[model samples]
Target: VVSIPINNAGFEDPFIEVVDDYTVDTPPGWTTYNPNNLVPEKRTTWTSNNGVGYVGPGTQFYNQLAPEGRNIGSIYLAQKPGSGVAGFEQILDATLEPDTKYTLKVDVGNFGGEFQKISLAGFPGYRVELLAGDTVLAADHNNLYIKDGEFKTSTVTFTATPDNPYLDQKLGIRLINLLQGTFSGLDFDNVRLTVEPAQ
Candidate 1:
């Protein structure tokens, strides 16, 4: 029953409408991070390729469609050349528990869409991290190679026992864009975390 609560996990908030394109903005319910401090934040959401050709609402250039709701979270680095890594994070109310197994997973997508305004290319690498206060419980570092306008689930698991350092620390999530390049962006959606008695 300890599914753990995550606000705006699907990135369906800050409601928006689009036909077939990308909209850049600060995502709600999550703290944003841009280490380089690039102008015009590139983090935003995607709308489906419904009219162009798609099966879902936020399908965009993918025939596979957004895995969760009508829209999905996006991370882009097609800005002026500098450090091109940035993303958003959320601190959950739940904390670490001893003898508990924590399984954290997030949906990731690589954008291969080549439009006039947005000509996305190669995978820029991504990381999904699970944290307790300031300590990293576990992380999935560039594990999944998913571009091609499709979404893949990246999972990271950690068993919290009596030895866990940061017990009772607030749980947190950090979704990151880990590469520096141009015309390449990443997509994300549907974050999930489950805590169970040691299995």
Candidate 2:
């Protein structure tokens, strides 16, 4: 059977605020990238207010790591030098099983680019993988690129192979920077996982 956490605990805080003319959503519980560190903020939309952060819509955030340009509603990833892992990975754990077909559903869109998509791919991007111990049940690149400025939903479904039987697994959102430097980073949100009974 497939089990998913429905509560909004591990999920990103649903952004519904506006600060200035820019909108932003900080990763819940995760440390924001150090502006003076190897991966400085190429562009940060939301700033700290009384120590708390907020994310709205219709804003564009960027960083030198992923020099490309991450506007509202798009996940951005910057390649770390030489590591093959883009930069930092926003790890979100979810109940996953091997051999079982899992579907990841996410609501992505920016209200006037307030807080749009979850940025996770910039340099080499990342590979969303389901891990059951040492066995890799399923892994796929974040290719569900939604170019529309409107909100949309993405579903990633796949069944484990025979060699990789469906066992109790945990989902890992990792960035595999396939470039060469030192460090980069990836930003994302609205992550979910759903498992279906084996056919």
Candidate 3:
């Protein structure tokens, strides 16, 4: 089981590994990426201050927009102009063994009319089901809503049943928008991944 503690790192916090209950190490092959204030056409991203920082709910995750940017919040703001939708994304590489059954769990917050999912579809040489236990999120994808002034945790687990002969692949957990709604935002933390012997 890989337990990712919430609020461990600051905005620019580098990724680290927890070896055991009290030990920590740097994950050699692991890399984490979070894109904020992204302007791909202008070749700009993570405006330093625009990046999400770790803060407690009551103190940080407030309705920054309710009073019109006067308040702060743990939840980030994603604005979509016309048909274009905006959201922040963090990608991590998990090189796993072949034919493995994995269980993923995490605390999701402030998903105010926004969308979120953990997808494992980017790898080549095989196709696997990137299932989510949140049936509402799995089916509609747009219905996974998180309320304001509160937070909730959502647990997701899926098995990597390789249809091909690849030994390793990458999995990505993403927060995205499917419909043009509130556009408030979403927050996910304390993400954990558990792997069981494939049989």
Predicted model with the maximum TM-score: 1
Candidate 2 displacement at residue 82 in angstroms: 5.4
TM-score, each model?
0.83, 0.46, 0.48
* Cand. 1 Cα-lDDT: 0.71
| Candidate number with the higher TM-score (1 or 3) | 1
What does candidate 2's lDDT look like per residue over 1-199, in tens digits?
Answer: 5556533323334343553232233334433332223333443533221011233333343211111122222223232354233222333456344456776554433222223454422322334444454444555555544332333444556676556543445554332222332112323335567677656
lDDT per model vs. reference = 0.71, 0.38, 0.33
User: Where does candidate 1 clash, by residue pair?
Assistant: 48-59, 48-60, 49-60
Per residue, candidate 1 scores C-alpha lDDT tens digits across 65-168 of 66776667776664544466677778998988899999998988776766666667667788899999988789998877675777789999988889878999
Candidate 2's C-alpha runs over 4 A off are 1-3, 6-58, 61-83, 86-99, 106-126, 145-154, 160-166, 169-171, 175-187
lDDT of 3: 0.33
Instruction: Provide the lowest-lDDT 10-residue window in model 2.
Output: 63-72
With candidate 1 superimposed using the best TM-score fit, by how many Å does residue 119's alpha carbon deviate from the native? 2.3
Q: Total clashes, candidate 2?
A: 41
Candidate 3 TM-score to native:
0.48
